[PDB]
Amino acid sequence: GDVEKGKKIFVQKCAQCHTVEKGGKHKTGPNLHGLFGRKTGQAPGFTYTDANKNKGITWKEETLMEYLENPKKYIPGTKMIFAGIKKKTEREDLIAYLKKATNE
Numbered sequence: 535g536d537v538e539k540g541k542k543i544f545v546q547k548c549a550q551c552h553t554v555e556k557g558g559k560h561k562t563g564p565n566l567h568g569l570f571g572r573k574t575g576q577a578p579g580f581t582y583t584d585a586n587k588n589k590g591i592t593w594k595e596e597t598l599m600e601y602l603e604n605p606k607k608y609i610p611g612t613k614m615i616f617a618g619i620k621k622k623t624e625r626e627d628l629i630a631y632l633k634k635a636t637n638e
């Protein structure tokens with residue numbers, strides 16, 4: 535996906551609750567550094583819902599594509615407020631950005 539378009543989506547839809555830099559602060563939502571290849575609910579120092587904590591999936595392209603379309607459907611009970619991104623290409627672009635930034 536397109537990293538620059540993804541970064542724009544992140545800034546407008548995600549940065550108000552999340553950081554992505556290594557050891558970046560928690561905000562309303564957990565810091566997302568190291569997300570890829572890790573189970574749900576594993577950001578050190580963040581207090582997750584049991585729902586998020588116990589979803590038992592690994593974050594990766596496939597699971598984020600589904601989740602970001604409709605978070606509350608994928609993790610019923612989540613405390614994350616976000617309707618969803620309808621467009622597959624927008625999801626891909628965002629995920630490409632996240633794959634870059636959360637791995638810096």
Ligand code: HEC
Nearest residue numbers: 547548551562563574575576577582583586612613614615
């Ligand atoms: C913009 C589209 C995003 C994206 C890419 C993510 N979020 Fe959030 N988020 C918020 C909170 C409170 C949580 C914890 C939910 C809970 O404990 O029930 C989350 C969680 C996530 C995750 C899962 C992290 C994990 O380690 O399992 C992911 C991948 C994620 N978010 C991505 C809070 C917010 C917001 C507050 C109003 C909004 C806006 C966003 N998140 C937006 C996004």
